[PDB]
Amino acid sequence: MQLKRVAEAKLPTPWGDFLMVGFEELATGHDHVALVYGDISGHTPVLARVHSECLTGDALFSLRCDCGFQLEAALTQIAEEGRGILLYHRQEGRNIGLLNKIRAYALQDQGYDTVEANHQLGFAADERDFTLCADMFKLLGVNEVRLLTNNPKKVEILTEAGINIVERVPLIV
Amino acid sequence: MQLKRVAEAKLPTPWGDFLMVGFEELATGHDHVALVYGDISGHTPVLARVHSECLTGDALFSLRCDCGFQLEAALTQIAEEGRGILLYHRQEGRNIGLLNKIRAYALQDQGYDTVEANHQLGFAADERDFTLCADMFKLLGVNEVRLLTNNPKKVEILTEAGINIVERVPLIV
Ligand SMILES: [Zn+2]
Ligand SMILES: [Zn+2]
Secondary structure, X not given: OOEEEEEEEEEEXXXXXXXXXXXXXXXXOOEEEEEEEOOOOOOOOEEEEEEEOXXXXXXXXXXXXXHHHHHHHHHHHHHHXXXXXXXXXXXXXXXXXXXXXXXXXXXXXXXXXXXXXHHHOOOOOOOXXXXXXXXXXXXXXXXXXXXXXXXXXXXXXXXXXXXXXXXXXXXXX | OOEEEEEEEEEEEOOEEEEEEEEEEOOOOOEEEEEEEOOOOOOOOEEEEEEEOOHHHHOOOOOOOOHHHHHHHHHHHHHHHOOEEEEEEOOHHHHOOHHHHHHHHHXXXXXXXXXXXXXXXXXXXXXXXXXXXXXXXXXXXXXXXXXXXXXXXXXXXXXXXOOOEEEEEOXXX
């Protein structure tokens, strides 16, 4: 357990009110957030999206990735379902950080691909720790998860990270 | 000088390409970003917007503030001008942090106003350090600034922080 649940408040959006729950990394004070729509109590598996933060795509209208597009799509789909969770996993640039992400982007501007750029900068293709997501689900009292994603490989990755995924729900985009 | 300029890369948006410049706080490694549109060289004052980060408004579609609305409006206006800068000042919740911002929001959900909530949590109404913005402008070779804002008080605040503002340009919203 790398996190603690510290506060919650209302987050009104165009799709309705989500309960915003803030989590804190015990060792660093770094934050993560979960947006909970409706009543997620009960034994029924809970619909959920794991969204890793991308400042450029999520906030700065970047056209070089689909993160912002996916964020809106997931929130919309969860609200439509009427019950669900979106985890905002704050590990920018597959966990290499924003500044290194800009360095990687500069190399990509020169013809390098994301894997090549990261390698030249001294990082693996993906350095994210998804067990932080398992922590958030556990702290929210969630067991079985219906994971929103169009990539079966992501189901494998998250299951390995300790998330009990019982179904893959295509992300409507 | 609290910052150093460390990397830059292209940020394509619906309004055209911005040059994204990443800055690093020398003492913490924390990042800030500047989005530069067009050619800002020359003696002419440069149009600029200082936008303090708001995760909820900028990325999570929050309806409880206008930050996301203002972010889009400023980027649009700068691109229309053809030359300009948007500083993305990363001091969430007037510099009290996201987790404390959620705590403040919880008190606001109970009837407290932002100033009362912050005070109860042990913070002033606004703890931001805008000299970080002056640092970014200096590192970008910018002297005179035409500040995008509808609040004359903000011009006073930023001028006190060391930014040479020669004109206030209403933010078209
Ligand atoms: Zn992205
Ligand atoms: Zn805001």
